[PDB]
Amino acid sequence: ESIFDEEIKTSEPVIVDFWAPWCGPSKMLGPIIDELSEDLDGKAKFTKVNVDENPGIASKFGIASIPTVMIPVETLVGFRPKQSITASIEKHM
Amino acid sequence: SIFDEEIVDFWAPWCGPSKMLGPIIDELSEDLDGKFTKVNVDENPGIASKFGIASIPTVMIVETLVGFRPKQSITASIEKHM
Amino acid sequence: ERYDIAIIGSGPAGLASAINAKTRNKSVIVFGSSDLSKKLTLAPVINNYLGFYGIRGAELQEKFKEHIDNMGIQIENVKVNNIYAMGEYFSIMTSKDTYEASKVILAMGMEHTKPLKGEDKFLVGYSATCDAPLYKGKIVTIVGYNKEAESEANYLAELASKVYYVPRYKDEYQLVSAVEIVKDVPVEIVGDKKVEKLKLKSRELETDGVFVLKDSAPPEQLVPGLYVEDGHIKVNRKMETNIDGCYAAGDCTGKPYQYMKAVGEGQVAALNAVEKLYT
Amino acid sequence: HMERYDIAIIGSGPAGLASAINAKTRNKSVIVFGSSDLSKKLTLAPVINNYLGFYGIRGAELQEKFKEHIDNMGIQIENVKVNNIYAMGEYFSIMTSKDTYEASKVILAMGMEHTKPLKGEDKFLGSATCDAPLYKGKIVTIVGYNKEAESEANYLAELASKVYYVPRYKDEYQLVSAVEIVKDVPVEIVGDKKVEKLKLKSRELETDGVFVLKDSAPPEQLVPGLYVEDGHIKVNRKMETNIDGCYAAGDCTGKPYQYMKAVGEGQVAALNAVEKLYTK
Ligand SMILES: Cc1cc2nc3c(=O)[nH]c(=O)nc-3n(C[C@H](O)[C@H](O)[C@H](O)COP(=O)(O)OP(=O)(O)OC[C@H]3O[C@@H](n4cnc5c(N)ncnc54)[C@H](O)[C@@H]3O)c2cc1C
Ligand SMILES: Cc1cc2nc3c(=O)[nH]c(=O)nc-3n(C[C@H](O)[C@H](O)[C@H](O)COP(=O)(O)OP(=O)(O)OC[C@H]3O[C@@H](n4cnc5c(N)ncnc54)[C@H](O)[C@@H]3O)c2cc1C
């Protein structure tokens, strides 16, 4: 947890994937997020948060859904395909 | 004489397209007053030959448009040339 | 086992797409009702379908049915809950089973509108089962369009401090005692920063979260990431949506609602979908 | 303002027919130009399995179904070929050799046209009847695809210093002695500032201007001012051309050539055409 907070302060946008084992969409995003991290190695860095394991992290940022992608700059709720996420990063940087 | 000083629709009575163009030209002048002359190739071949009119229905501005053209295209071209 | 093409809907578009995809030796699956389309069967007389002057809807429906049966095309009688565009393929989600296919074609017809949902979607829900733990000890309201929604409402009662269930259908409700039934017409969702209250015609409910569990999902929700403008899926000349390898045809695209456009739109989608498999 | 139809449909194929029945559905006067046989391709095709509702049906049999439909709706095909369509603004003037017609809206339904090699680059430098006086006492070459060209060549020969006729059809040619017949296939036209020579497979001809007389005109020539890209008419979702009141449907727009696309496109064009008439 501490390591994540240190990374949040550093940088190079940082993307948080909020997911739960039970939620089907969240499972879909992790493979998409893994593919995004492999594709992007410089523009941004990705971290995965299990909402089940880190309830404190979730409440603090006001996560509204089990599968949510967060980068303060912008917040995407619900499953999204790679192309949409990538484009949102591109402009937002 | 006035036209030469200022310096055109080339039309002929046998060409159907040139006939259609005339009335189209007339509408354009009425429609846009501020931002046209008709040349009869039959009566002024010298005027036509001098400018190199190679097709009877030709519109001459800087820019030459040969063949019939609709109101929208001609207006757009004129606006672009300005 | 992934099919080459998956067709969402069994209407004129879906069938028109199906026969063209099957013609070119590509594996095809069609999701829909055993009856092709309620509109086809219901139509009294159709004069604008070329070649079938004065044909009854049910009579035209018969001609279409013969076409696919004679071609060995079977309708998968299931409803598609969700379709997740993975990138190279599409995962199709259904309560009874899960399928994946390389290309998708949408033929959903028309769906019910949403009241002021999209204003604060982040602080609103659609999954319910996904978001229940977040609302522990909080007020939850559910707008139910089917029985599955009732069951989700019973589930929420276990976690939430208060659960409201608003039925849009008239039926006996199988609900636990904790759930409160609210028989009124939803109007608007309002909140300052996040959802705070749900306004009905004759009642107001203060609630932290609102869940709208729908029987006929909109295309945007059914396919996460699909670009929809003016209530109809966006398509280019080839019937391509914003998602690569995802097509749409028929009433869903948004043009005049007619059979002949629907079949044409479906055909163009299928032929182009086949083209993309190669090259 | 005489006999102005609400909608004029150019072509009697599936797209043209699909548009016609829809325009007739909404009580709008319609005229359809095309062949009495509607479409050669329909009659010629062996079987259709991808037209939904007809399985393994021979082309000629499908053509019969289409004839019954229009016949039941009181739609008659005017069996003439459309030579030109001039967009005047509020209406369209439709020229044929036999008569002249005017319509508020137009729908184009012609599947294919003859290709031109090196024509469009020097079109300006080289409508023979309309531009013949300009070429008095000059060399002019004619490429003829129909009998009208022979008559036009004989006319041109009287005014020009030299007339060449390149026939693309094998038939007896009724031509004056002054006109010279050249049995070869054109290859390329060449010129720097103006047309200078027309190149054939085994021959080269020095000429001032070249006139190309075709039996099946391309859409660009048929409708002066129409925007065409990639050999097909450009159309938006509603089947609208660059011309404000001209639609197009079927093989002419482009894409896959198929019956169901053609009829769908024809329907959308017609319905859109009706809608614009309704607003007024
Ligand atoms: C009474 C009536 C008369 C009509 N008459 C005419 C006419 O005379 N001429 C004319 O041109 N048009 C007519 N129409 C309209 C025309 O029929 C429709 O536009 C056309 O039928 C639409 O076909 P479609 O498949 O696009 O939509 P539909 O035909 O409605 O296709 C919908 C199909 O998709 C299935 N489906 C939907 N959602 C899902 C999902 N989420 N998952 C799985 N499956 C799903 C549905 O169950 C259904 O099978 C008429 C309509 C009606 C109601
Ligand atoms: C043997 C053969 C088999 C085929 N089989 C199939 C099949 O099984 N399934 C399928 O989907 N497609 C098939 N096609 C292709 C399909 O038929 C075409 O895409 C379709 O015919 C296009 O219809 P259309 O109305 O847009 O144009 P067309 O059918 O080509 O229109 C031709 C009509 O337009 C008239 N016309 C053209 N120009 C003018 C003009 N300037 N002035 C006046 N009239 C004009 C002509 O008189 C003619 O009657 C086949 C084609 C062939 C040759």
PDB file of C-alpha atoms in Angstrom, chain D residues 66-248:
ATOM      1  CA  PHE D  66     -40.520  -7.518 -59.399  1.00  0.00           C
ATOM      2  CA  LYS D  67     -42.741  -7.018 -62.455  1.00  0.00           C
ATOM      3  CA  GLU D  68     -45.793  -8.156 -60.481  1.00  0.00           C
ATOM      4  CA  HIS D  69     -45.020  -5.708 -57.666  1.00  0.00           C
ATOM      5  CA  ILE D  70     -44.765  -2.574 -59.811  1.00  0.00           C
ATOM      6  CA  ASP D  71     -47.683  -3.716 -61.976  1.00  0.00           C
ATOM      7  CA  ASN D  72     -49.843  -4.075 -58.865  1.00  0.00           C
ATOM      8  CA  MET D  73     -48.870  -0.558 -57.763  1.00  0.00           C
ATOM      9  CA  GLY D  74     -49.600   1.047 -61.139  1.00  0.00           C
ATOM     10  CA  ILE D  75     -45.962   1.845 -61.946  1.00  0.00           C
ATOM     11  CA  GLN D  76     -44.975   1.953 -65.619  1.00  0.00           C
ATOM     12  CA  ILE D  77     -41.411   2.070 -66.940  1.00  0.00           C
ATOM     13  CA  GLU D  78     -40.746   4.615 -69.682  1.00  0.00           C
ATOM     14  CA  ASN D  79     -38.526   2.560 -71.998  1.00  0.00           C
ATOM     15  CA  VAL D  80     -35.992   5.224 -72.955  1.00  0.00           C
ATOM     16  CA  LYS D  81     -32.342   5.938 -72.190  1.00  0.00           C
ATOM     17  CA  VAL D  82     -31.588   9.106 -70.218  1.00  0.00           C
ATOM     18  CA  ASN D  83     -28.924  11.236 -71.900  1.00  0.00           C
ATOM     19  CA  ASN D  84     -28.595  14.156 -69.450  1.00  0.00           C
ATOM     20  CA  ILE D  85     -29.882  15.673 -66.202  1.00  0.00           C
ATOM     21  CA  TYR D  86     -29.347  19.385 -65.427  1.00  0.00           C
ATOM     22  CA  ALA D  87     -29.698  20.531 -61.797  1.00  0.00           C
ATOM     23  CA  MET D  88     -31.382  23.941 -62.062  1.00  0.00           C
ATOM     24  CA  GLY D  89     -31.900  24.523 -58.328  1.00  0.00           C
ATOM     25  CA  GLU D  90     -35.590  24.045 -57.582  1.00  0.00           C
ATOM     26  CA  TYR D  91     -35.978  21.162 -60.054  1.00  0.00           C
ATOM     27  CA  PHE D  92     -34.142  18.824 -62.424  1.00  0.00           C
ATOM     28  CA  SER D  93     -34.478  18.969 -66.198  1.00  0.00           C
ATOM     29  CA  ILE D  94     -34.216  15.513 -67.748  1.00  0.00           C
ATOM     30  CA  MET D  95     -33.131  15.322 -71.385  1.00  0.00           C
ATOM     31  CA  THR D  96     -33.753  12.406 -73.711  1.00  0.00           C
ATOM     32  CA  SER D  97     -33.500  12.225 -77.481  1.00  0.00           C
ATOM     33  CA  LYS D  98     -37.265  11.697 -77.662  1.00  0.00           C
ATOM     34  CA  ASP D  99     -38.588  14.232 -75.132  1.00  0.00           C
ATOM     35  CA  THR D 100     -37.761  16.517 -72.211  1.00  0.00           C
ATOM     36  CA  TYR D 101     -38.931  15.991 -68.625  1.00  0.00           C
ATOM     37  CA  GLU D 102     -38.682  17.980 -65.376  1.00  0.00           C
ATOM     38  CA  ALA D 103     -38.769  16.581 -61.809  1.00  0.00           C
ATOM     39  CA  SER D 104     -38.333  17.989 -58.275  1.00  0.00           C
ATOM     40  CA  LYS D 105     -36.104  15.137 -57.069  1.00  0.00           C
ATOM     41  CA  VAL D 106     -33.892  12.626 -58.875  1.00  0.00           C
ATOM     42  CA  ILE D 107     -32.641   9.155 -57.959  1.00  0.00           C
ATOM     43  CA  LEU D 108     -29.789   7.533 -59.889  1.00  0.00           C
ATOM     44  CA  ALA D 109     -29.758   3.751 -60.429  1.00  0.00           C
ATOM     45  CA  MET D 110     -27.270   2.800 -63.151  1.00  0.00           C
ATOM     46  CA  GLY D 111     -24.812   0.059 -62.183  1.00  0.00           C
ATOM     47  CA  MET D 112     -21.792   0.426 -64.514  1.00  0.00           C
ATOM     48  CA  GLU D 113     -20.271   2.707 -67.193  1.00  0.00           C
ATOM     49  CA  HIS D 114     -17.508   2.595 -69.828  1.00  0.00           C
ATOM     50  CA  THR D 115     -14.036   3.408 -68.505  1.00  0.00           C
ATOM     51  CA  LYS D 116     -11.942   6.180 -70.056  1.00  0.00           C
ATOM     52  CA  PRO D 117      -8.149   5.919 -70.638  1.00  0.00           C
ATOM     53  CA  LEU D 118      -6.366   9.294 -70.366  1.00  0.00           C
ATOM     54  CA  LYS D 119      -9.633  11.101 -71.138  1.00  0.00           C
ATOM     55  CA  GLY D 120      -9.998  13.221 -67.989  1.00  0.00           C
ATOM     56  CA  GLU D 121      -6.514  14.763 -68.097  1.00  0.00           C
ATOM     57  CA  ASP D 122      -7.092  16.518 -71.433  1.00  0.00           C
ATOM     58  CA  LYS D 123     -10.902  16.710 -71.392  1.00  0.00           C
ATOM     59  CA  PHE D 124     -10.765  20.518 -71.461  1.00  0.00           C
ATOM     60  CA  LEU D 125      -8.657  20.675 -74.629  1.00  0.00           C
ATOM     61  CA  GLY D 126     -10.829  18.114 -76.438  1.00  0.00           C
ATOM     62  CA  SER D 127     -20.727  17.489 -77.037  1.00  0.00           C
ATOM     63  CA  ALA D 128     -19.601  17.530 -80.655  1.00  0.00           C
ATOM     64  CA  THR D 129     -22.763  19.263 -81.875  1.00  0.00           C
ATOM     65  CA  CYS D 130     -22.396  21.947 -79.189  1.00  0.00           C
ATOM     66  CA  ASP D 131     -18.674  22.634 -79.847  1.00  0.00           C
ATOM     67  CA  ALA D 132     -18.252  21.914 -83.586  1.00  0.00           C
ATOM     68  CA  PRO D 133     -18.074  25.574 -84.755  1.00  0.00           C
ATOM     69  CA  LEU D 134     -14.970  26.174 -82.627  1.00  0.00           C
ATOM     70  CA  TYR D 135     -13.032  23.554 -84.635  1.00  0.00           C
ATOM     71  CA  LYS D 136     -13.744  24.935 -88.119  1.00  0.00           C
ATOM     72  CA  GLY D 137     -10.899  24.042 -90.458  1.00  0.00           C
ATOM     73  CA  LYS D 138      -9.083  21.958 -87.834  1.00  0.00           C
ATOM     74  CA  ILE D 139      -8.463  18.256 -87.329  1.00  0.00           C
ATOM     75  CA  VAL D 140     -11.013  16.493 -85.127  1.00  0.00           C
ATOM     76  CA  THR D 141     -11.156  12.795 -84.218  1.00  0.00           C
ATOM     77  CA  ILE D 142     -14.284  10.876 -83.221  1.00  0.00           C
ATOM     78  CA  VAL D 143     -14.489   7.683 -81.164  1.00  0.00           C
ATOM     79  CA  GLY D 144     -17.939   6.226 -81.842  1.00  0.00           C
ATOM     80  CA  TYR D 145     -19.816   3.770 -79.633  1.00  0.00           C
ATOM     81  CA  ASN D 146     -23.219   4.172 -81.341  1.00  0.00           C
ATOM     82  CA  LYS D 147     -24.859   5.135 -84.625  1.00  0.00           C
ATOM     83  CA  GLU D 148     -25.439   8.746 -83.546  1.00  0.00           C
ATOM     84  CA  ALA D 149     -21.664   9.194 -83.786  1.00  0.00           C
ATOM     85  CA  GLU D 150     -21.663   8.295 -87.490  1.00  0.00           C
ATOM     86  CA  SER D 151     -24.273  10.998 -88.074  1.00  0.00           C
ATOM     87  CA  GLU D 152     -22.277  13.444 -85.943  1.00  0.00           C
ATOM     88  CA  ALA D 153     -19.068  12.531 -87.790  1.00  0.00           C
ATOM     89  CA  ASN D 154     -20.683  13.259 -91.158  1.00  0.00           C
ATOM     90  CA  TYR D 155     -21.807  16.627 -89.782  1.00  0.00           C
ATOM     91  CA  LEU D 156     -18.382  17.449 -88.360  1.00  0.00           C
ATOM     92  CA  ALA D 157     -16.657  16.460 -91.607  1.00  0.00           C
ATOM     93  CA  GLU D 158     -18.387  19.311 -93.461  1.00  0.00           C
ATOM     94  CA  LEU D 159     -16.961  22.008 -91.159  1.00  0.00           C
ATOM     95  CA  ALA D 160     -13.556  20.618 -90.137  1.00  0.00           C
ATOM     96  CA  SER D 161     -10.489  20.284 -92.350  1.00  0.00           C
ATOM     97  CA  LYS D 162     -10.206  16.566 -91.501  1.00  0.00           C
ATOM     98  CA  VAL D 163     -12.410  14.047 -89.689  1.00  0.00           C
ATOM     99  CA  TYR D 164     -11.242  10.702 -88.286  1.00  0.00           C
ATOM    100  CA  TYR D 165     -13.733   8.094 -87.084  1.00  0.00           C
ATOM    101  CA  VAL D 166     -12.633   5.397 -84.636  1.00  0.00           C
ATOM    102  CA  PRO D 167     -15.432   2.782 -84.485  1.00  0.00           C
ATOM    103  CA  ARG D 168     -15.801   0.639 -81.385  1.00  0.00           C
ATOM    104  CA  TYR D 169     -18.674  -1.423 -82.851  1.00  0.00           C
ATOM    105  CA  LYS D 170     -18.588  -3.933 -85.713  1.00  0.00           C
ATOM    106  CA  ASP D 171     -21.323  -2.859 -88.133  1.00  0.00           C
ATOM    107  CA  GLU D 172     -21.734  -1.221 -91.510  1.00  0.00           C
ATOM    108  CA  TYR D 173     -20.928   2.478 -91.157  1.00  0.00           C
ATOM    109  CA  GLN D 174     -22.979   5.104 -92.998  1.00  0.00           C
ATOM    110  CA  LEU D 175     -20.347   7.829 -93.345  1.00  0.00           C
ATOM    111  CA  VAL D 176     -19.473  10.450 -95.939  1.00  0.00           C
ATOM    112  CA  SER D 177     -16.444   9.957 -98.164  1.00  0.00           C
ATOM    113  CA  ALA D 178     -14.586  12.830 -96.477  1.00  0.00           C
ATOM    114  CA  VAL D 179     -14.547  11.023 -93.105  1.00  0.00           C
ATOM    115  CA  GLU D 180     -11.753   8.448 -92.764  1.00  0.00           C
ATOM    116  CA  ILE D 181     -12.366   5.156 -90.931  1.00  0.00           C
ATOM    117  CA  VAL D 182      -9.642   3.960 -88.538  1.00  0.00           C
ATOM    118  CA  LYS D 183     -10.003   0.361 -87.294  1.00  0.00           C
ATOM    119  CA  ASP D 184      -8.056   0.403 -84.042  1.00  0.00           C
ATOM    120  CA  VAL D 185      -8.597   0.592 -80.282  1.00  0.00           C
ATOM    121  CA  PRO D 186      -7.710   3.944 -78.661  1.00  0.00           C
ATOM    122  CA  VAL D 187      -4.975   3.751 -76.040  1.00  0.00           C
ATOM    123  CA  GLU D 188      -4.045   7.250 -74.869  1.00  0.00           C
ATOM    124  CA  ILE D 189      -4.557  10.942 -75.650  1.00  0.00           C
ATOM    125  CA  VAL D 190      -1.466  13.165 -75.492  1.00  0.00           C
ATOM    126  CA  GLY D 191      -0.955  16.928 -75.298  1.00  0.00           C
ATOM    127  CA  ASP D 192       1.069  19.632 -73.513  1.00  0.00           C
ATOM    128  CA  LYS D 193      -1.189  22.714 -73.377  1.00  0.00           C
ATOM    129  CA  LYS D 194      -3.915  21.549 -75.776  1.00  0.00           C
ATOM    130  CA  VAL D 195      -4.809  18.202 -77.325  1.00  0.00           C
ATOM    131  CA  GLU D 196      -2.264  17.247 -79.985  1.00  0.00           C
ATOM    132  CA  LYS D 197      -2.533  13.516 -80.741  1.00  0.00           C
ATOM    133  CA  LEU D 198      -4.689  10.459 -80.043  1.00  0.00           C
ATOM    134  CA  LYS D 199      -2.659   7.263 -79.628  1.00  0.00           C
ATOM    135  CA  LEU D 200      -4.014   3.873 -80.708  1.00  0.00           C
ATOM    136  CA  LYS D 201      -2.617   0.367 -80.301  1.00  0.00           C
ATOM    137  CA  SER D 202      -0.970   0.292 -83.742  1.00  0.00           C
ATOM    138  CA  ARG D 203      -1.472   3.894 -84.900  1.00  0.00           C
ATOM    139  CA  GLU D 204      -1.073   7.545 -83.913  1.00  0.00           C
ATOM    140  CA  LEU D 205      -3.320  10.367 -85.138  1.00  0.00           C
ATOM    141  CA  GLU D 206      -2.445  14.070 -85.233  1.00  0.00           C
ATOM    142  CA  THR D 207      -5.599  16.000 -84.318  1.00  0.00           C
ATOM    143  CA  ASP D 208      -6.570  19.302 -82.721  1.00  0.00           C
ATOM    144  CA  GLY D 209      -9.578  18.025 -80.760  1.00  0.00           C
ATOM    145  CA  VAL D 210     -11.020  14.637 -79.823  1.00  0.00           C
ATOM    146  CA  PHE D 211     -14.728  13.917 -79.226  1.00  0.00           C
ATOM    147  CA  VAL D 212     -15.776  10.732 -77.383  1.00  0.00           C
ATOM    148  CA  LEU D 213     -19.320   9.506 -78.175  1.00  0.00           C
ATOM    149  CA  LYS D 214     -20.433   6.761 -75.765  1.00  0.00           C
ATOM    150  CA  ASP D 215     -23.475   4.483 -75.703  1.00  0.00           C
ATOM    151  CA  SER D 216     -23.594   4.261 -71.877  1.00  0.00           C
ATOM    152  CA  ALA D 217     -22.427   7.566 -70.429  1.00  0.00           C
ATOM    153  CA  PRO D 218     -20.712   7.624 -67.018  1.00  0.00           C
ATOM    154  CA  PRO D 219     -22.553   9.195 -64.073  1.00  0.00           C
ATOM    155  CA  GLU D 220     -20.202  12.192 -64.044  1.00  0.00           C
ATOM    156  CA  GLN D 221     -21.121  13.109 -67.630  1.00  0.00           C
ATOM    157  CA  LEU D 222     -24.779  12.092 -67.343  1.00  0.00           C
ATOM    158  CA  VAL D 223     -25.223  14.616 -64.523  1.00  0.00           C
ATOM    159  CA  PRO D 224     -22.987  17.668 -65.032  1.00  0.00           C
ATOM    160  CA  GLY D 225     -21.365  18.675 -61.758  1.00  0.00           C
ATOM    161  CA  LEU D 226     -21.825  15.379 -59.902  1.00  0.00           C
ATOM    162  CA  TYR D 227     -18.991  14.523 -57.515  1.00  0.00           C
ATOM    163  CA  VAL D 228     -17.600  11.029 -58.157  1.00  0.00           C
ATOM    164  CA  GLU D 229     -14.720   9.422 -56.250  1.00  0.00           C
ATOM    165  CA  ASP D 230     -13.153   5.996 -56.825  1.00  0.00           C
ATOM    166  CA  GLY D 231     -15.382   5.265 -59.809  1.00  0.00           C
ATOM    167  CA  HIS D 232     -18.575   5.355 -57.728  1.00  0.00           C
ATOM    168  CA  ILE D 233     -21.025   8.113 -56.875  1.00  0.00           C
ATOM    169  CA  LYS D 234     -20.368   9.660 -53.474  1.00  0.00           C
ATOM    170  CA  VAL D 235     -23.271   9.394 -51.032  1.00  0.00           C
ATOM    171  CA  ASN D 236     -23.794  10.127 -47.361  1.00  0.00           C
ATOM    172  CA  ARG D 237     -25.979   8.014 -45.025  1.00  0.00           C
ATOM    173  CA  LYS D 238     -29.186   9.420 -46.612  1.00  0.00           C
ATOM    174  CA  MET D 239     -27.950   8.724 -50.167  1.00  0.00           C
ATOM    175  CA  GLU D 240     -27.370  12.416 -50.875  1.00  0.00           C
ATOM    176  CA  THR D 241     -24.963  13.533 -53.589  1.00  0.00           C
ATOM    177  CA  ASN D 242     -23.006  16.794 -53.714  1.00  0.00           C
ATOM    178  CA  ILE D 243     -26.141  18.094 -55.463  1.00  0.00           C
ATOM    179  CA  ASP D 244     -28.699  19.293 -52.918  1.00  0.00           C
ATOM    180  CA  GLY D 245     -31.622  17.495 -54.578  1.00  0.00           C
ATOM    181  CA  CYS D 246     -30.004  14.442 -56.193  1.00  0.00           C
ATOM    182  CA  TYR D 247     -29.828  11.003 -54.572  1.00  0.00           C
ATOM    183  CA  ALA D 248     -28.177   7.802 -55.770  1.00  0.00           C
TER     184      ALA D 248
END
